[PDB]
Design a protein around this ligand. Structure first.
Ligand SMILES: *[C@@H]1O[C@H](CO)[C@@H](O[C@@H]2O[C@H](CO)[C@@H](O[C@@H]3O[C@H](CO[C@H]4O[C@H](CO)[C@@H](O)[C@H](O[C@H]5O[C@H](CO)[C@@H](O)[C@H](O)[C@@H]5O)[C@@H]4O)[C@@H](O)[C@H](O[C@H]4O[C@H](CO)[C@@H](O)[C@H](O)[C@@H]4O)[C@@H]3O)[C@H](O)[C@H]2NC(C)=O)[C@H](O)[C@H]1NC(C)=O
Lengths: 120, 128, 107, 120, 120
């Protein structure tokens, strides 16, 4: 339903994310179905990744990966009070997959740390 | 399971060099070290050495360091978890002191601290 | 270099305990001890590995112990077939067995 | 599979929820597929909502929203020991979407509270 | 994407799991779609079960069910250092559904225990 939360696309990153304010087989029958499958393929594209980082059911999950300053050497105040999610994404878009892999191993090892912890 | 059938109990005289076979079955020959151990009649049971049918890595005792040649040819797949390998071992400057029954045994597990431990033994081969 | 008991024996219903000790080069706190049932001149049998672990199929009567200076093999509730010789190992994760002198038993 | 847990539909709310005791493209080929897509569209209808309330993987999640007595001014003993889930739903069906929105903001703010907590 | 993590299929169980090191309606149009639906039917086959055991977003979740030695009377050292996930599965494949049901009731009761705990 309401997956269009773009309402704060021109606002600063910290102002938007941190503190909100029966078919018939014809060309509308197979069109409307592929549009229904194409939507949930992509909802599971991300909810699977959110599960691989220990972030299932979380909009703001903190991680265990320090910030490599080579990704972006910019201050908290010149990110969350100056940039917008649309343009920050573009600036950090190149390293987006390195962080994903690295998030994945931080959660996998965290899964076995609690495994050694609950063994006592 | 698994069974390690050995070679024949043939005898030779000093100065020679005999090879002892060990044909495995019922288990993955690559997954466990093969281990030979000698029971000399005038000594205590002496561990000779294990080799890795996978890594090809060997480790002998310092009493057989430059005197024993241990090898294995590749395994023949039988099913998903069954193979058939062959294990070979010789002795260099052989004498009559090395008289006794020779055994081959596969390793215990394939991980941990007791990896190569001679768990499943063969039939032994009488020398003299 | 690894010495054990000279010899022990018991009767059907009681228990024994085979010693196993040596110098600091072979014994003990920094090494794993294994116990083998070995009829002389025949195919042996693993019974105990890394101190107190029982091999597969081994009856729960066999028990292993290891103080900082020696390792024991308790054979509770003897049976006729337990009349053999026994030897202990001394190994690490990457090494080879250093067997013992030998200990025989009977009922 | 076993999504038919209606076995206690005529039982009291507290007795039921609190303490249980290769196709061919023809008219059975496109029928059986739409029935397969129509099932998981709806499983993700709810599992997404369960994720937007901090309730992923929970059958009984407690929330942070006090009960507005204008929704139902009835006692715990005249709900979970007298009514059944089928008829309670109908009585409170009108405010069902107000509570959803309100659940959503309680979890979103709870996501940033722990964000301020883990920043120390 | 990378659902092929079979890379350690011939390794021991403890070495693998505990410490890693626009269509056209034709025969490629309906083939490619059913292959897309058949994939996410099965991803939700398991992620639903993972939700019914209190294991959403977890690769290694500890449970509250003691090991019935009639399932397998084998040691930790002769499982995670000797067997491989492929053959362990086959050995314990018969009781695989008894454990599932039993996992399900352990989590359901755990959901109401915390319900009685958060009521104070
Ligand atoms: C595929 O299947 C094979 C067969 O099972 C697997 O090979 C086995 O892997 C296990 C580990 O999973 C091995 O157990 C370890 O054995 C080593 C002994 O080797 C060490 O000592 C050698 C002699 O001194 C030495 O030469 C070695 O050093 C190098 O040499 C070899 C090749 O020559 C190389 O393979 C090495 O990697 C080194 O490069 C080596 O140091 C032993 O040291 C280990 O003990 C440590 O680790 C365990 C945990 O693993 C820990 O519990 C211990 O306390 C200790 O810290 C460990 O016992 C086994 O020997 C291998 N071979 C067999 C079983 O025949 C292979 O791993 C599988 N691969 C995959 C991808 O599935």
């Amino acid at each position: 339903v309401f997956l269009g939360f773009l309402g704060a696309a021109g606002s600063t990153m910290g102002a938007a994310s941190n503190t909100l304010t029966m078919l018939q087989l014809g060309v509308w029958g197979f069109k409307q179905l592929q549009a229904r499958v194409l939507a949930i393929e992509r909802y599971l594209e991300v909810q699977q990744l959110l599960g691989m980082w220990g972030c299932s059911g979380k909009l703001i999950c903190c991680t265990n990966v320090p910030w490599n300053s080579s990704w972006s050497n910019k201050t908290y105040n010149e990110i969350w009070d100056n940039m917008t999610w649309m343009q920050w994404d573009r600036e950090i878009g190149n390293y987006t997959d390195t962080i994903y892999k690295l998030l994945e191993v931080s959660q996998f090892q965290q899964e076995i740390n609690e495994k050694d912890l609950l063994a006592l | 399971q698994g069974q390690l059938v050995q070679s024949g109990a043939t005898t030779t005289k000093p100065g020679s060099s005999v090879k002892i076979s060990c044909k495995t079955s019922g288990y993955r020959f690559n997954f466990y070290h093969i281990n030979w151990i000698r029971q000399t009649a005038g000594r205590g049971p002496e561990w000779m050495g294990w080799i890795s049918p996978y890594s090809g890595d060997k480790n002998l005792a310092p009493a057989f360091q430059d005197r024993v040649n241990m090898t294995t040819d590749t395994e023949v797949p039988v099913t998903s978890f069954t193979s058939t390998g062959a294990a070979y071992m010789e002795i260099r400057n052989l004498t009559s002191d090395d008289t006794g029954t020779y055994f081959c045994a596969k390793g215990l597990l394939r991980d941990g601290s007791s990896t190569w431990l001679p768990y499943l033994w063969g039939q032994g081969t009488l020398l003299t | 270099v690894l010495t054990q008991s000279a010899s022990v024996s018991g009767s059907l219903g009681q228990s024994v305990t085979i010693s196993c000790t040596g110098p600091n080069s072979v014994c003990c706190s920094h090494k794993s001890i294994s116990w083998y049932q070995w009829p002389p001149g025949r195919a042996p049998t693993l019974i105990i590995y890394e101190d107190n672990e029982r091999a597969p199929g081994i009856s729960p009567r066999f028990s292993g112990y290891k103080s900082y200076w020696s390792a024991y093999l308790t054979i509770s509730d003897l049976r006729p077939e337990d009349e053999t010789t026994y030897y202990c190992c001394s190994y690490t994760h990457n090494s080879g067995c250093v067997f013992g002198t030998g200990t025989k038993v009977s009922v």
